[PDB]
Amino acid sequence: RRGSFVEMVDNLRGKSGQGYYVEMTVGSPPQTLNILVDTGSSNFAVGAAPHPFLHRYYQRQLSSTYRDLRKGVYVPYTQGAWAGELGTDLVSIPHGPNVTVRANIAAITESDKFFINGSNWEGILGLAYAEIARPDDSLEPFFDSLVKQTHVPNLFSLQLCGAVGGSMIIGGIDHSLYTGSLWYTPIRREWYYEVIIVRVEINGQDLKMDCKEYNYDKSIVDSGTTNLRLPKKVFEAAVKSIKAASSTEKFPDGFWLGEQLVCWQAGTTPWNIFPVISLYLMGEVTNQSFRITILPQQYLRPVEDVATSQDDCYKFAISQSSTGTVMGAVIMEGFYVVFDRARKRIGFAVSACHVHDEFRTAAVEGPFVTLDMEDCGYN
Numbered sequence: 001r002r003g004s005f006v007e008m009v010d011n012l013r014g015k016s017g018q019g020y021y022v023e024m025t026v027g028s029p030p031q032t033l034n035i036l037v038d039t040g041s042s043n044f045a046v047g048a049a050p051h052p053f054l055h056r057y058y059q060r061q062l063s064s065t066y067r068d069l070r071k072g073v074y075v076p077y078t079q080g081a082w083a084g085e086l087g088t089d090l091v092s093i094p095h096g097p098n099v100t101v102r103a104n105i106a107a108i109t110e111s112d113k114f115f116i117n118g119s120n121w122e123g124i125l126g127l128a129y130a131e132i133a134r135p136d137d138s139l140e141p142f143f144d145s146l147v148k149q150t151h152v153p154n155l156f157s158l159q160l161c162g163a164v165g166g167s168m169i170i171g172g173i174d175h176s177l178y179t180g181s182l183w184y185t186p187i188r189r190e191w192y193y194e195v196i197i198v199r200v201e202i203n204g205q206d207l208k209m210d211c212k213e214y215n216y217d218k219s220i221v222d223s224g225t226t227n228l229r230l231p232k233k234v235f236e237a238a239v240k241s242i243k244a245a246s247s248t249e250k251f252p253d254g255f256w257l258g259e260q261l262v263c264w265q266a267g268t269t270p271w272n273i274f275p276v277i278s279l280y281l282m283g284e285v286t287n288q289s290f291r292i293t294i295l296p297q298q299y300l301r302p303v304e305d306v307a308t309s310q311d312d313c314y315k316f317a318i319s320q321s322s323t324g325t326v327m328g329a330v331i332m333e334g335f336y337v338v339f340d341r342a343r344k345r346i347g348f349a350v351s352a353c354h355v356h357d358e359f360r361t362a363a364v365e366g367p368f369v370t371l372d373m374e375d376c377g378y379n
């Protein structure tokens with residue numbers, strides 16, 4: 001219940017729900033920048049040239065400790081891409097661990113639909129493993145450098161508080177960030193933070209899909225992705241069930257596709273008419289699983305108000321994917337997520353800051369009995 005990690009609490013910020021970022025200071029003399037926390041990629045990169053959406057950027061000529069690697073780097077994402085130049089420099093996180101390391105850094109010189117207007121972040125911290133780093137797995141990711149060069153335990157945890165703030169505890173866990181117990185699911189393979197979903201329920205009702213469909217291709221935990229993205233067949237079945245569950249009100253088809261949004265008079269959003277969604281994850285013991293449950297407050301996201309108006313507009317943030325399940329911010333904002341790399345597992349617990357109402361709350365419950373969970377994974 002105590003807190004030796006107090007200085008790392010509340011070290012994350014967000015602007016109009018456009019990405020959670022932490023301050024990172026690079027080079028010498030110090031150059032501090034706002035960096036997006038992304039567990040869905042593995043490259044540490046910072047804007048290094050003027051751009052319409054950037055307030056500031058990394059100026060390598062001003063850093064005496066900058067070391068040019070003489071190699072270009074290109075990183076394409078689901079949304080956007082950028083080109084840059086590799087090098088290494090001293091990096092520290094003011095509100096993170098009390099250490100300084102020399103890490104690889106990609107200086108972003110050109111980009112397309114990457115930076116987001118008004119987001120206040122100027123770079124990205126890829127927290128996933130080396131296998132997915134660009135140009136290749138020989139480019140050591142920032143966290144790997146942190147663990148190799150210092151005594152910091154191989155583990156970090158994220159509390160993303162939606163509507164924007166949060167905490168990234170590096171090297172441990174802070175008990176003030178969650179309630180109840182922490183439940184762990186294994187990290188299937190160390191590339192993306194891959195996990196295995198064994199069952200899906202909408203308002204306690206089993207979607208009844210073969211679990212292989214839930215992980216077709218893969219299922220990952222990705223703080224760099226806004227939505228809960230699901231494979232085509234899963235998406236369709238989920239929307240069908242969600243619509244049936246919230247039949248007390250009808251919405252245009254475009255709403256469920258994220259193309260149309262619906263607004264309610266400030267403070268009147270009928271959260272109660274929307275169902276809860278539960279994802280069962282493989283547990284750490286044979287045939288044992290647990291489930292995490294989110295509320296409509298997590299999958300219905302606010303859209304930057306017109307100008308402090310009397311209308312709360314929302315977008316349905318569950319969408320389709322062709323590269324597996326992506327448990328993005330809509331999932332993470334309901335919990336305190338522990339990325340226990342040391343023990344190859346990811347923990348989930350109810351977040352002390354998740355958005356809810358006086359009738360329902362996000363939950364993490366278990367254990368449950370689920371047979372043949374191993375077969376749910378894709379090979």
Ligand SMILES: C[C@@H](NC(=O)c1cc(C(=O)N[C@@H](Cc2ccccc2)[C@H](O)[C@@H]2NC(C)(C)N(C)C2=O)cc(N(C)S(C)(=O)=O)c1)c1ccc(F)cc1
Pocket residue numbers: 017018019020036038040041076077078079080113114115124192222223224225226227228229319326328329
């Ligand atoms: C900051 C912002 N991100 C987005 O608005 C975004 C980024 C990616 C993305 O590609 N994320 C990658 C990182 C990235 C790209 C561009 C800008 C910032 C960050 C991420 O690496 C992603 N992981 C996987 C492995 C899926 N992949 C291939 C990626 O590119 C995908 C989507 N979708 C397609 S969506 C509408 O959510 O279905 C949206 C955001 C806003 C609020 C949050 F609360 C958390 C993150």
